[PDB]
């Protein structure tokens, strides 16, 4: 019996290389080869596949990428036409962002790993430099969602079993828009300084221009970027220090073809010892049936089979993705792509070369710098926090106590001079009392500097269903403390059980 | 003349579909009901592709209704790929190839008559709420869609003031006896008289027989499951118990002529609205053999108004993913006779389920009070 | 035995049979899920031998 291994390549040199590779692999039944060039329209190409590529149909088709930067519309129709009959697909170089779904694509095997493994490498690198704070931001809808989900399931599963990295803020924006200064300033207003990004080429150039406008390179902003953003179109406007990654053998199509034909020959030799073989028909028209050999062959291929080739040990995870790839840690050493090291498996290997960081700093920057300007919220309560209008000079009238000591007034900035009929922020109204006096003693003891502003709603806060939406949100002080509008609550706030779920109440000031 | 190609394959449904054109309810004098009831029996990729390309090249087709008889999602994949290629609104409605698929590409947004996993989770929680079953668990597998299911369950479980008691969430893997020991110990530790799962048919049978071997009978454990393990009816294995509650689309009391007339009414109304608010219709480039004709993708998206269509006094809106906003779900339950009959109905966030108090699965006593 | 041991829910169990019947009952109960966490089985010297 003969097994005609179908294929679809873009250049005749690749076809000759595949012919030589299958002739070499025939040394170890018989094997053959069939190749069809890529068409500008995927419909006619799909017809040629259904008519010529699967004219024998007993094989695992392999597909490559065209020089076009699409990389999705060209590999998707072969995968669809092969998964119709549950025929496995081999992928040499593809955008593995969407192709990792077992429901959309039934059977699909790739050679290059997706960016999920790149996020895993990012996490492994973070585990070395003790960076426990990072603000990521994704741009693409699916690719960005997949990268975010991968990073979240990596950081959360490790946190369950020091403090351990917290992704401080996850930002998302449109990959087609250009106004991101709002999100840039929102990220700047945070504490973390280890911004990891995962955008497209044009989006990378736009965010680089935005960061250069905001000057996010003052020797404190560590950058971690992907391979899709180190291209020349974005490297032309890329800042220094932008540590990036790059996979080895990204354009070597012949080596990928050799590895694919080797592993498929190994899979054929392993599966030929089975019992039932449902040979696909010699023609795709009129044959409405499922090949029983397809799923079982894919299962016995992905289970344990592997053939060492140009990339060494090649293990497939449970998604149709080749694992244990090679990542080159590249740093922008003054517009020079120098290899700081290599990555393989789970261990990171640095070449011990001259490694720098953005901003000219030759030392490892810290993860973050804690701010000493934390906002403080306060309520107006009768003997705790007095609220009196300020004098016209700018300060307010200072009085003496019963003994002759100062009264320790603080300049509150809350809207207490207006009514709910016309809410408007008014002039600062100096405030004083028992727990504002407590607040000054805490500030001198731990040497921080604080401002204060009263609440907007007025109530202390509880859980209530919103008027229009479905989710429940807190109110007043609790809402302003949770939603990043206040870092502390210096006011009489009775400790409860419904509030300790999301708040960490210290030891009680007074019973 | 808006070209409407209605393709029916597999079975033979030569019926009064022409009543759609005989209704004469087309107010806008531009959507000509050019129906093409082409039939075929070979549901092959090349066959359907050549058929749709020849039909689009011979006539001026702008909307492709579709129906079938098999249960293969690959037909829906081919349909969505053709929609991406030629950028024309297509309709696969209640034929058995609707088979809702998620994370669709940036194609011409088309919707298929099928409920989303989120809507199924919502209707199952409404079912659990109707009978005061405020305790359950989650037993999912490594099938694409479990993450969305558990995320919807969590988003709906902590956004209300109802005391839902989530016992434990399981993530089983079909690798070796380790998963068997895990599911056995967990189901022995669950002790909750409501169980949910999400996997395929064979995995469902495996899990059910394993649980019955561990002792998951129908006395207290009342299993609930979406329509993923049900599939085509009248093929019930022996592993399924007599207490399984499943939900599914309106497969019984929803006629195929009604489905095709609703689809053609949706298409005509959307085209009418778009051509009345834009006063310009794009050119149906009938190449399907050269990417050079794809340059016509410059006008406003027809889908932006197609997803906002209503007719016959019924809301027929759609989302950007391609699923119904009102799927008109129906509850199904299998008795000891190994037959799936309807129990309740869910439509427009309203549950009209009959059989007031749970056709209960010798200690069950009623009590009179005043 | 499966239904009953699922309904027992008592962290102490006693039995009385021969050696082979004891092994059979123990393997069946472990298949049903009678582990050593809560179920602390007690038995006379008849199954020990
Ligand atoms: C889009 O981005 C530009 C540039 O970042 C923003 O322009 C800025 O304008 C505001 C005025 O509201 C100034 O405070 C900033 O200093 C400007 N930035 C720079 C770099 O000069 C613009 O506001 C953003 N939004 C829109 C809608 O254009």
Tab-separated table of N, CA and C in Angstrom, chain A residues 474 494-502 505:
chain	number	residue	atom	x	y	z
A	474	UNK	N	-21.035	49.013	45.550
A	474	UNK	CA	-21.067	49.677	46.847
A	474	UNK	C	-21.464	51.141	46.698
A	494	UNK	N	-17.834	51.618	61.564
A	494	UNK	CA	-18.026	50.411	62.358
A	494	UNK	C	-17.650	49.175	61.553
A	495	UNK	N	-16.787	48.338	62.127
A	495	UNK	CA	-16.365	47.110	61.460
A	495	UNK	C	-17.540	46.141	61.415
A	496	UNK	N	-17.781	45.562	60.245
A	496	UNK	CA	-18.879	44.630	60.039
A	496	UNK	C	-18.358	43.393	59.305
A	497	UNK	N	-19.277	42.490	58.969
A	497	UNK	CA	-18.951	41.282	58.223
A	497	UNK	C	-19.134	41.430	56.723
A	498	UNK	N	-20.138	42.190	56.282
A	498	UNK	CA	-20.335	42.436	54.859
A	498	UNK	C	-19.273	43.353	54.270
A	499	UNK	N	-18.525	44.072	55.106
A	499	UNK	CA	-17.485	44.982	54.646
A	499	UNK	C	-16.084	44.402	54.739
A	500	UNK	N	-15.848	43.464	55.656
A	500	UNK	CA	-14.539	42.833	55.783
A	500	UNK	C	-14.224	41.879	54.639
A	501	UNK	N	-15.189	41.600	53.759
A	501	UNK	CA	-14.927	40.720	52.625
A	501	UNK	C	-13.920	41.344	51.667
A	502	UNK	N	-14.068	42.640	51.393
A	502	UNK	CA	-13.213	43.336	50.442
A	502	UNK	C	-12.309	44.375	51.090
A	505	UNK	N	-9.834	45.745	57.674
A	505	UNK	CA	-9.983	46.673	58.789
A	505	UNK	C	-8.896	46.414	59.826
